[PDB]
Symmetry: C2
């Protein structure tokens, strides 16, 4: 997964939001404090994951 | 899921990163352009999802 330093993510926030949407690929934001670290993905991909999970549970 | 306007998310980025970590709960960032919309969650929770998916496929 693409990994992005916090400062770089903050400095280019809209670009990264467009990237995860346009690429259907998540990224990780890297902090010096690991308890701040996050994953960013499009709502479309998140919904894909959640719909797939519920469909798979039904099947 | 908690929904956060883009401007509010940008203005309080570190607070929201700490929130998704401390709460083990994702949030959605709401843009005027839906193709910019994202989900933010902790790396810990993402890893939980991915480990669970692979374990469930094995079982």
């Amino acid at each position: 997964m693409e990994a992005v330093l916090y400062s770089t993510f903050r400095n280019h926030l809209k670009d990264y939001m467009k990237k995860v949407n346009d690429e259907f690929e998540p990224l990780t934001v890297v902090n010096k404090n690991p308890d701040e670290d996050i994953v960013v993905l499009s709502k479309s991909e998140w919904d894909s994951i959640q719909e797939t999970l519920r469909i798979a549970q039904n099947k």
